[PDB]
Amino acid sequence: VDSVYRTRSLGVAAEGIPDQYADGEAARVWQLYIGDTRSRTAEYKAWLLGLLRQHGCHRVLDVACGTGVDSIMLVEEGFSVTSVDASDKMLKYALKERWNRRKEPAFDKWVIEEANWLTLDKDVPAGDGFDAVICLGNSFAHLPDSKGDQSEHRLALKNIASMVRPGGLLVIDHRNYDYILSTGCAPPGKNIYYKSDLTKDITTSVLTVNNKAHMVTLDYTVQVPGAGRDGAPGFSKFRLSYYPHCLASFTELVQEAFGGRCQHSVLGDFKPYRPGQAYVPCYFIHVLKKTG
Amino acid sequence: VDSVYRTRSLGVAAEGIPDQYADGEAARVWQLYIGDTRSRTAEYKAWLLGLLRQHGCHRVLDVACGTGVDSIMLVEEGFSVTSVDASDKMLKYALKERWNRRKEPAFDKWVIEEANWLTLDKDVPAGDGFDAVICLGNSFAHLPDSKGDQSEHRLALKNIASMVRPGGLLVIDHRNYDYILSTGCAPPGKNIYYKSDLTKDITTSVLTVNNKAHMVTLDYTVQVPGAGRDGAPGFSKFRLSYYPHCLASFTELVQEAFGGRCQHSVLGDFKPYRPGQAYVPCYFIHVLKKTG
Amino acid sequence: VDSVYRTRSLGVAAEGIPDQYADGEAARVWQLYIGDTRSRTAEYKAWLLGLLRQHGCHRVLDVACGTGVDSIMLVEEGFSVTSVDASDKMLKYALKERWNRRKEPAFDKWVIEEANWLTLDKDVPAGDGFDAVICLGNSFAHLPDSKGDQSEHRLALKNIASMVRPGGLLVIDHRNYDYILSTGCAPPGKNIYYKSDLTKDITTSVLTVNNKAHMVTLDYTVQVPGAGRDGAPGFSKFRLSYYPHCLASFTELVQEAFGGRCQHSVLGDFKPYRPGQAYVPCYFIHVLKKTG
Amino acid sequence: VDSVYRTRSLGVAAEGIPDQYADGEAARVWQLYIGDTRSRTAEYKAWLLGLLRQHGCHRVLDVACGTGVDSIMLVEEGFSVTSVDASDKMLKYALKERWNRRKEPAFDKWVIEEANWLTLDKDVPAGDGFDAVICLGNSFAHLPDSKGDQSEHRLALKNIASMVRPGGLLVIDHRNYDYILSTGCAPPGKNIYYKSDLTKDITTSVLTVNNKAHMVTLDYTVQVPGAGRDGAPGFSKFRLSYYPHCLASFTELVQEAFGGRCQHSVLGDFKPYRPGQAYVPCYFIHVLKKTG
């Protein structure tokens, strides 16, 4: 018989006071980290828009909304964007931006909802489905596999696909985990979508359970400018984890998601990718095409 | 030399996956608690409105927004309302309603920001200061006194008082703690602002540090309807802590937050209050008035 | 679905490495605290021995052994001492002392076993019972009342009494919690048994659940000599909790332990105690006498 | 500003009440694990004794005592044994047996102290140093490398080597980690020292930090016999971590702990070992020899 009475239950709030670990030295950096968001890559801009237009799909579904930068560019670019995400900590940043630009017809017609890839089915009305669904930024790797059988993976995937209209497109990516798993390192400065103007340091931790890799953990040591003595910066650190997804595993995974009635194709970093390829991609973007 | 490797830093999120403790069985109830009290009291509506009108103050500031159910009525009532709070888990609900009704001019003009009492100065621009400032719901009792010298209580009240325009009003409240401190119990069904329709149970725990009452902790066991077998209710529980504010104590505290240059009043539940009163108030509402 | 993988399970050890929190800055002080043990009080020496002899009981049972100082003096004084305690963290200190003096016939015949007042029955063979059982040092107050009904109290007590031979004696004490509860403070320098040569500071925290006091917590700030800059001492802190036992409650509690077939008597600090007594005792020593 | 008030400081005890995590369902198993392997191996007995005799060394030092089952046999065999360890939760068992048999001259002469490899120098007086020093059981793998530069491994080995008299012997061992690192599994029933009679299950988790193997974590699910319904076994589990020591690595590590002035040898499970060997060892036993 022991005891450890804690002030407030975990996951509950009180007005007047900041949410639990909301202002920890680790939450602060991650904040100004998820904010290094804006400095997007031309290659990224020119690729997504061109791919988007080239197939004439207008109704886009972003199932990994987040701060809402991918979607804000789609909103500006004229597509019918509906953004969804499971983290209300992230979504808060999209809605903030929207409100500001609510005066803009486009931004006002912008739909930012909340949803989980595992409940997506009963989280977003599909109806006819959407022209295109995007899940970029290596975001599918955030969802872990507790049961070890990747049952939740197939579900998240199954669901996200059902959001795809027949003829619709699915642009889903993942980091080159084959490479990081092989080398045992996932260094900063490879993100193809948004150039991080933030200097960093990353310690890669790879965990294998009974020989099967199960998780890749990243400990970041960000050099926060101005948080130092005389102009000097500060060094805070935060931690995030992902599931090491191998190109092979994913390719078939994402495929059974459509039950086969699909059209698969894998891009190198943004360019076409063919095995044995001389160039090692830092990301693996899968673009699917539902049959019916 | 030990260790305890955790998946994600405390207070950080990842897109696609729900936030840290957002779905515990404690958060689910707390959720239907911060929302299952909303059935505003006629006595409340009529008292606040009337008093607001009586002194003819229009530009109001709600420094304890929360789910916004307070502000939403001032808004609805034509007041120039700006609602603030420190907890984002709470505001999310005020902005969720505002957006919902953004198609209403008043609501559209509704300002919902984020702010902390201890930083309210450089968090919200007053310039001339607001005519009125409410802080009902016993929200002030959420902020604790770690130092033991309530230095923060004073910082909070100074800041919050500084937000009042000369001739301006302040309406800050608290529960009758002189009473629960004595009975050692803080039973449910005493909200004078919103008649909850939720069946609750509460165990009261009072902590006196060195003969001085330092905190009140409420462990609520909510009887969640249907959450059981055959329609039977389920029993989930969360915990919340407060600072026991005694009347004498608060009366002089909130006052020194005005440097004395104020006009203080204190009423019963809603009717006016005098020591020794026959009727025992369930809440103590202070209504101050800045001179200059 | 979250996670927080910790290195070693809680409560398990590995050779070569120190036990979990065994060398924390709080464990260090408590160590040199439970060690201030030696500087026993004459009043204490002259009272226990004289009481012991006066009734000619030789077979003594110490159910709150600990470091083993109370028992070491009994061992030296010639009684047939069998010392028992539930904390292997404490017992380790008794055995250490014994081993050293194992060469001394007396110390070799000394019995240091392990046992819980709640399993005492099947933890120590009583047989005929013992002449005298001692539980001094306010040690019975360590066992808390989780269920709130003091069911474990009656059991611990019930058991400890069954260790008493008919005609045997039970010398059990407790701190004057009536006074500390009333004043809300339990200051250092009152221990009647062993003069603590260690300067301290104590913050008393009293917890009441639904008006019924349930626990008294003591936060000690010990002035460790030499742990300072230039001769200066250091200031570490540790924390311990007790159940606020009121003379009245205890008197009847300890009594039902014998089912009434007893002879009760309460000593002031060491002197006889009669209600309304001008002198406020810092400890309450109960000496019982089993009938049969 | 939050809080989490806990009953007792971490690592402190109170008399009468069991120690902090001493009785978790994880400690109960770990208990019948650190004890349910003891059925010493004839190959072991015969190898150690013989080698000890072969070099004629008599004053032995067991720097990884534990439950003492090792030393107890050297003791029984007339060796001048002194057994040390850092974990008191373990020694408690060696001294529990010693006392039990204190009535034996050899056992009586048995020295069981407390010590840490990183402090062994000023923890145990050598003067001339011991003839032999065993550290079997793969105990060295318990100490981890937080810094990441194994500076402690070196401190531990230096200290431990310093305890060897010139011409003295050192017998330190480790599991064949070159193998479990590759299969990614560390199955049960491989102790060459004591044939456990316990049915176990083990999930192996390897953590590589930046391409470097940094820790091995074993989650054991013991099938506790009878701990079920009708004689059926129960299933309790504990966790333990180790440092993956590769042969090449250790070979040069333990060597530099002698400044080179040594004679190194390494054998298979017990037989002698040569790289590429046909037989795969389950443990790597290094047997060094100090020159001067």
UniProtKB/Swiss-Prot annotation, chains A, B, C, D:
Q: Which residues carry this modification: N6-succinyllysine?
A: K45, K190, K195, K200
Per UniProt, subcellular location reads as:
Cytoplasm
Which superkingdom is the protein from? Eukaryota
This protein's record includes keyword Flavoprotein:
no
- Phosphoserine PTM sites in chain numbering: S9
The residues listed in the UniProt record as binding (6S)-5-methyl-5,6,7,8-tetrahydrofolate 1, with positions renumbered to this chain, are S3, Y5, R239
Q: Which residues carry this modification: N-acetylvaline?
A: V1
| Activity regulation, short description | Inhibited by 5-methyltetrahydrofolate monoglutamate and by 5-methyltetrahydrofolate pentaglutamate, inhibition is much more effective by the pentaglutamate form than by the monoglutamate form. Two molecules of 5-methyltetrahydrofolate are bound per tetramer. The binding sites are localized between subunits. Inhibitor binding may preclude movements of the polypeptide chain that are necessary for enzyme activity.
Amino-acid positions noted as binding S-adenosyl-L-methionine in the UniProt annotation, renumbered to this chain: 21, 30, 33, 40, 64, 85-87, 116-117, 136-139, 175, 220
Reaction(s) the record says it catalyses = glycine + S-adenosyl-L-methionine = sarcosine + S-adenosyl-L-homocysteine + H(+)
Q: How does it assemble?
A: Homotetramer.
Read off the PANTHER family from this record.
GLYCINE N-METHYLTRANSFERASE
State its role: Catalyzes the methylation of glycine by using S-adenosylmethionine (AdoMet) to form N-methylglycine (sarcosine) with the concomitant production of S-adenosylhomocysteine (AdoHcy), a reaction regulated by the binding of 5-methyltetrahydrofolate. Possible crucial role in the regulation of tissue concentration of AdoMet and of metabolism of methionine.
This protein's name: Glycine N-methyltransferase
Q: What is the lineage of its organism?
A: Eukaryota, Metazoa, Chordata, Craniata, Vertebrata
Report which gene this protein is encoded by: Gnmt
